[PDB]
Design a protein around this ligand. Structure first.
Ligand SMILES: Nc1ncnc(NCCc2cnc(NC(=O)Nc3cccc(C(F)(F)F)c3)s2)c1Br
Length: 257
């Protein structure tokens, strides 16, 4: 089917995203509940990212995993581009983290497990996400973590704050699948602490701290969590833990559900 906007009943705004807003939507024939992100053609052309969006649709057409948000397809009119997306009823992990300030070890390890599984699937079909962050993680009906937004994704090897990016990427160097592993380490830190490890008021300071791998743990972080994060956040990408090593880490096994 060739989708048009007239096929959908538009609901309430679900959030404000990269190049436009995400709305709740219902397909008129089947009454199916979904999400539509509305992007503008001018904004996509001016950024020179139209090929990246075409790649995302392509990449998402092949990917099938319960911990990955579905992109069903897209369509456009005169001015706007519409992404047909799976609805995530429990919102962003970003919103959940603001609500709870920080997650307990049980919730964190469960998310990391789910993340790792999703990434393990992506890396086997050789896809790197490159944009792992709380705002690109959503929660399904049963509170399961779902990864979204493959706009910055590439095949290995090869917008916002610098917080989740590894030293190789910020320095404009060569990078592979191990970037998602660094971002997972940043995630795990932020989930438990409430803020990312290299957080700063300035871009330049954040750049300094990532380059040096300059970060400390607060007193309440356990040694098990400290171990995982330290072994994920290593300047040398080849020295970082693999996803299987993460899923088999003592602290993950002990706290994950
Ligand atoms: N509760 C919810 N339930 C379901 N979805 C929600 N939000 C949508 C999450 C997304 C998933 N995928 C996305 N994709 C992109 O937008 N990609 C994108 C965007 C701009 C430019 C580009 C590019 F052109 F630069 F690549 C690529 S946004 C929410 Br809140």
């Amino acid at each position: 089917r060739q989708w048009t906007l007239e096929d959908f009943d538009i609901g309430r705004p679900l959030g404000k995203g990269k190049f436009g807003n995400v709305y709740l939507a219902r397909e008129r024939q089947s009454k199916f509940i979904l999400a539509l992100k509305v992007l503008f053609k001018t904004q996509l052309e001016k950024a020179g990212v139209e090929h990246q969006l075409r790649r995302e649709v392509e990449i998402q057409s092949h990917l099938r995993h319960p911990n990955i948000l579905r992109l069903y397809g897209y369509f456009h009119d005169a001015t706007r581009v519409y992404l047909i997306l799976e609805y995530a009823p429990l919102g962003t992990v970003y919103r959940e983290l603001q609500k709870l300030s920080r997650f307990d070890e049980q919730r964190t390890a469960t998310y990391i497990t789910e993340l790792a599984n999703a990434l393990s699937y992506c890396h086997s079909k050789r896809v790197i996400h490159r944009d792992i962050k709380p705002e690109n993680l959503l929660l399904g009906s049963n509170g399961e973590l779902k990864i979204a937004d493959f706009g910055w994704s590439v095949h290995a090897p090869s917008c916002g704050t610098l917080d989740y990016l590894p030293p190789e990427m910020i320095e404009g160097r060569m990078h592979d699948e191990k970037v998602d592993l660094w971002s997972l380490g940043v995630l795990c830190y932020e989930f438990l602490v409430g803020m990312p490890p290299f957080e700063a008021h300035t871009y330049q300071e954040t750049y300094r701290r990532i380059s040096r791998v300059e970060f400390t743990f607060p007193d309440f972080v356990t040694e098990g969590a400290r171990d995982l994060i330290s072994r994920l956040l290593k300047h040398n990408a080849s020295q970082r833990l693999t996803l299987a090593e993460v899923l088999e880490h003592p602290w993950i096994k002990a706290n994950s559900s």
